[PDB]
Design a protein around this nucleic acid. Structure first.
Lengths: 52, 183, 40, 541
RNA sequence: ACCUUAAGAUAUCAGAGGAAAGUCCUACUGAUCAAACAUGCGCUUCCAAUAGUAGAAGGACGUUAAGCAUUUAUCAUUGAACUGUUCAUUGAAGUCAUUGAUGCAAACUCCUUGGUCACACACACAUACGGCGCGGAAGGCGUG
């Protein structure tokens, strides 16, 4: 699509590979591709807690 | 004149069988070789228990659960189950104070009037009926937020309760085999 | 009771058309000329 | 600047979408975002921006994938797609919504058929849809609306007027909430009959002649005879009404009057204890009635308010196991409840046992691998003990079945294989942070053979003794476990094991731990070593 | 608050009269036509067992029925194997149906409709058949 990409917080936090895709699957949340870096920064403290 | 009318009915006069709030279970046919501890061991896993009594020489006891669901499950599951070689017939009953009041009232044959058992004052959100506890929490729906202390106070259930249950189970399996308790 | 009486019929069933499409409808084209008749 | 780009460059869109992506399971942010995206399209028509329409469709689809039990949003999405002009995708949305409920959802079926009447316009297909719907959702307690729709459709389309009788006859026996309306329809429609021959619409001629003593071909004076037939039919209907009224009034008085909530709200909601108790009692009553369609309907209807509680999932699986004998059905129910329930511990345990029962061990191995991978292969350090304990038990079972025994007498190495011993010792290394130290020790004790006890002692108890961890050393249950491990050995003679205990084990403990180790040690001494009790109390002065 | 109007005519030809050429008219006169109403034709067709449990005409948007026989279920891009074939990916549309559709055929059940009239239970007929009881329905033709 244009200016919209699908991200999945559960698969991202589970340290898997397919946390982002352009196909509309189950458990995927729309997000702005311009703002994906801030999406990653939002989960930073929780993922660091999981890592530690 | 309309042909549809709301139904109306007569009340069944509030005895111990027709009371929906009744929780006590009257166990009859005991063999007198069973004590309060062993009877509590028999009737514990169906729910939490307020009190257990066995009148001396009356070959019958009472178990006062907290949940109506627990009492119904106990009656449905423990029926004809022989305690101390004697088969047991379960039915609904009353408390001890109510029993004494009824006995004095039928000796005086005056009124024979009963009072309904107190309710839980709905709505209650923490509790899940027919649940067991022995000894942080995000208050999410899946868990059991509140529960009853085992005798009585109210304690907030934690995640360590499953560990404590298994720990006590193994403790009483080791010691009960040696013979410090028949429970 | 405003429009409880004007209840319409159920929707009409569908039948595959047996005529020519509105785009294909035409009279006879390639009408041959009249000059050939005059000679013979 | 177009509407779609103006929306996508709006700042509020980023904040709403970030709240949604940060908190996927709240549904407040979901619903706020959906309301915003819908409202920012002031006209909804066929000419609005295709990109904006695609965005709205994808937002609705994502929310319906996140929360599968929202009937009202299924209906709203289907209606919006209907408004956009195309009905094929509306049919697809409704069918997907029905499948999400396993075809048992009264509101979805009612709205779907109400929409279907206007659109299908084919008698056979529409009536087949009605027959399919009634098989799944016809026995609902509140199913009056569906039967009203069915009866009005039959009365509007059919002209032979036999299907009307054949359907109202079935409706007469279902204990609905509004059985009175259908009984009044039956009474009026029997009261408007005008000749003997139309009584054949009711039942068969032989049945009328034999049971009710009514002769349809009775020729003569037919007025009083038809009145007699009407009186007999009304008496039969009165008896039917007696039965149905008893059933309906009992159900309403006992169970249905106490239930206040019948809709799925959100994963963040709490349901009341009284409602849980009445739901459980109502499910038990329905199971006792022994109707499979009604029981499935009532379980699926109970799943709506308390889906996230898992007690109803457990009860449904137990019923399917011990009352219908359908282990695959139980496996499917538990596998589906794994998605919904928030506890998942009891469901995972029961699912493990069930899958072991069905002799499907490849799926068991895959589930064990998945639950280990969900914790980044560090399941030995999970805060919740129950998941680790169930996983360890079943992984040990699989390891025993897969790897041949490395000890004598076919004594299968349960927890003494390097794959599982590593995890067990890694958890024991935390020593205050976890919760199952004593359970792990006590379940590691039970081996009861010469070489196996030698290995267990040397690897676990001797190593902890040399490391001198104060927590385990001062915990008397550890010493009880060690003494019990040695004393139950079937290799040592009684004198050898008594000598070993009294002269090796007890001197190894420090005297400053007496006030904490004395209870359990004395408990073991009283049970097994009454003679050595004097030595114990003398040494522990 | 918006709206106030197409105009003409009412059987037809021929003959006599009245207000050079029309023009109009005649409780004038012939012939044709049309309408209504009476009224007839040896006019033509049709009008259901009870001496029995039937039948005729028309339906079913009725069942058997998933009947018996055939036939249908996308397009583009990219990667991979392959001698056209198979698997996955992006985009585009997309009536529901496949227990459907189409072809064939049969049984069954049921609805509406009618003079269920009167006298008869009868040996007829080559000019082939008394059309020689009362009604009703529908037309054809004739007269007033």
């Amino acid at each position: 699509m244009r200016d919209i990409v699908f991200v999945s917080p559960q698969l991202y936090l589970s340290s898997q590979e397919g946390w982002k895709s352009d196909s509309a699957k189950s458990g995927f949340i729309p997000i702005l591709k311009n703002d994906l870096q801030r999406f990653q920064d939002s989960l930073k403290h929780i993922v660091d807690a999981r890592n530690s | 004149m309309s042909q549809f009318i709301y139904p109306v009915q007569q009340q069944p006069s509030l005895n111990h069988f027709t009371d929906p709030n009744n929780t006590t279970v009257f166990i009859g046919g005991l063999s007198s070789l069973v004590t309060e501890d062993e009877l509590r061991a028999y009737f514990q896993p169906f729910g939490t228990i307020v009190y257990v009594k066995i009148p001396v020489g009356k070959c019958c006891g009472f178990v006062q659960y907290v949940d109506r669901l627990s009492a119904e499950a106990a009656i449905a599951g423990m029926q004809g189950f022989p305690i101390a070689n004697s088969r047991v017939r379960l039915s609904w009953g009353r408390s001890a104070k109510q029993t004494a009041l009824l006995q004095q009232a039928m000796l005086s044959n005056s009124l024979q009037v009963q009072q309904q058992q107190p309710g839980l004052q709905q709505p209650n959100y923490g509790y899940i009926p027919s649940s067991t506890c022995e000894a942080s929490s995000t208050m999410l729906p899946g868990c059991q937020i509140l529960n009853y202390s085992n005798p009585q106070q109210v304690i907030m259930q934690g995640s360590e309760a499953v560990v404590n249950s298994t720990n006590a189970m193994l403790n009483r399996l080791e010691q009960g085999s040696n013979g410090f308790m028949f429970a | 009771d405003v429009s409880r009486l004007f209840k319409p019929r159920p929707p009409l069933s569908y039948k595959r058309p047996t005529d020519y499409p509105y785009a294909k409808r035409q009279t006879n084209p390639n009408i041959t000329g009249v000059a050939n008749l005059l000679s013979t | 600047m177009d509407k779609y780009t103006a929306l996508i460059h709006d700042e509020n869109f980023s904040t709403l979408t970030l709240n949604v992506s940060r908190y996927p399971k709240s549904l407040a942010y979901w619903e706020k975002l959906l309301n915003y995206i819908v409202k920012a399209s002031a006209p909804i028509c066929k000419s609005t921006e295709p990109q904006l329409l695609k965005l709205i469709r994808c937002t609705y689809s994502s929310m319906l994938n996140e929360f599968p039990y929202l009937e009202n949003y299924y209906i709203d999405f289907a209606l919006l797609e209907y408004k956009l002009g195309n009905v094929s995708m509306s049919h697809k949305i409704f069918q997907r919504g029905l499948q999400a409920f396993n075809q048992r959802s009264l509101l979805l079926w009612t709205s779907y058929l109400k929409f279907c009447n206007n659109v299908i316009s084919h008698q056979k297909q529409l009536f087949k849809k009605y027959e399919t719907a009634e098989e799944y959702v016809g026995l609902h307690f509140f199913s009056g609306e569906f039967w009203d729709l069915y009866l009005e459709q039959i009365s509007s389309r059919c002209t032979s007027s036999k299907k009307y009788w054949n359907v109202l006859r079935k409706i007469l026996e279902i204990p609905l909430h509004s059985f009175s309306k259908f009984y009044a329809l039956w009474l009026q429609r029997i009261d408007d009959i005008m000749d003997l021959k139309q009584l054949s619409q009711l039942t068969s001629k032989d049945e009328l002649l034999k049971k009710l003593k009514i002769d349809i071909n009775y020729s003569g004076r037919k007025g009083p005879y038809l009145q007699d037939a009407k009186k007999k039919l009304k008496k039969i209907t009165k008896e039917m009404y007696m039965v149905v009224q008893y059933q309906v009034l009992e159900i309403y008085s006992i169970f249905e009057s106490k239930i206040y909530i019948n809709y799925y709200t959100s994963p963040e909601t709490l349901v009341s204890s009284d409602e849980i108790e009445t739901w459980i009692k109502y499910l038990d009553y329905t199971i006792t009635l022994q109707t499979d369609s009604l029981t499935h309907l009532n379980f699926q209807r109970a799943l709506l308010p308390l889906a996230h509680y898992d007690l109803v999932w457990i009860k449904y699986s137990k019923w399917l196991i011990n009352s219908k004998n359908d282990l695959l059905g139980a496996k499917n129910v538990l596998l589906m409840g794994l998605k919904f329930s928030l506890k998942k511990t009891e469901i995972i345990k029961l699912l493990y046992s069930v899958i072991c029962k069905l002799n499907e061990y490849v799926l068991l191995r895959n589930l064990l691998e998945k639950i280990e991978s969900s914790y980044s292969d560090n399941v030995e350090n999970v805060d919740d003990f129950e998941i680790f304990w169930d996983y360890l038990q079943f992984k040990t079972f699989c390891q025993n079945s897969l790897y041949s025994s490395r000890y004598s007498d076919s004594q299968s190495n349960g927890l003494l294989n390097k794959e599982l011993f590593d995890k067990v010792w890694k958890r024991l290394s935390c020593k205050e942070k976890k919760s199952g130290q004593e359970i792990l020790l006590n379940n590691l004790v039970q081996f009861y053979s010469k070489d196996t006890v030698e290995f267990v002692e040397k690897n676990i108890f001797q190593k902890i003794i040399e490391f001198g961890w104060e927590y385990y050393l001062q915990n008397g249950m550890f010493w009880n476990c060690y003494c019990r491990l040695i004393y139950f050995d079937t290799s040592r003679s009684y004198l050898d094991k008594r000598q070993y205990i009294v002269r090796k084990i007890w001197p190894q403990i420090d005297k400053k731990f007496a006030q904490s180790v004395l209870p359990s040690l004395t408990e073991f001494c009283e049970s097994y070593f009454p003679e050595e009790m004097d030595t114990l109390e003398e040494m522990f002065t």
